[PDB]
Ligand binder design. Structure first.
Ligand SMILES: CCCCCCCCCCCCCCCC(=O)SCCNC(=O)CCNC(=O)[C@@H](O)C(C)(C)COP(=O)(O)OP(=O)(O)OC[C@H]1O[C@@H](n2cnc3c(N)ncnc32)[C@H](O)[C@@H]1OP(=O)(O)O
Length: 86
């Protein structure tokens, strides 16, 4: 009964396959909000698309609380569970 979400955040890494950057997109935003909180980082370095995708997706959430973030984060790591099959 902790950040089981943070446990999902492990699963999504174990998926037999680096999910599609677009599903990663969502996962990041909720993940990052839940673990970090209201984005204190900058827009893209070495991986533009990616860099913002994560930044941008999260940045979208800034203001939302860690747990709400979890609720959907988790449910979305859940999607990988199926998409890829962990
Ligand atoms: C469209 C671009 C991504 C959308 C925004 C970020 C997505 C984050 C949510 C999903 C987490 C990644 C899911 C698995 C993806 C892969 O597997 S791709 C890497 C090759 N690895 C594998 O196949 C095995 C598992 N992978 C890994 O352990 C890492 O390489 C990992 C995927 C976690 C990170 O690699 P990658 O996505 O290629 O680039 P990063 O910039 O290093 O990470 C993406 C962003 O997500 C944050 N992050 C790191 N680890 C996680 C986990 N476990 N869950 C969720 N989010 C994670 C990073 O902080 C990074 O964003 P930023 O902070 O902006 O750089």
């Amino acid at each position: 009964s902790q950040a089981e979400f943070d446990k999902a955040a492990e699963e999504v890494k174990h998926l037999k396959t680096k999910p599609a950057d677009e599903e990663m997109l969502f996962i990041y935003s909720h993940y990052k909000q839940a673990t970090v909180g209201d984005i204190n980082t900058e827009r893209p370095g070495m991986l533009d698309f990616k860099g913002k995708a994560k930044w941008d997706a999260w940045n979208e959430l800034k203001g939302t609380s860690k747990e709400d973030a979890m609720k959907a984060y988790i449910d979305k790591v859940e999607e990988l569970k199926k998409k890829y099959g962990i």
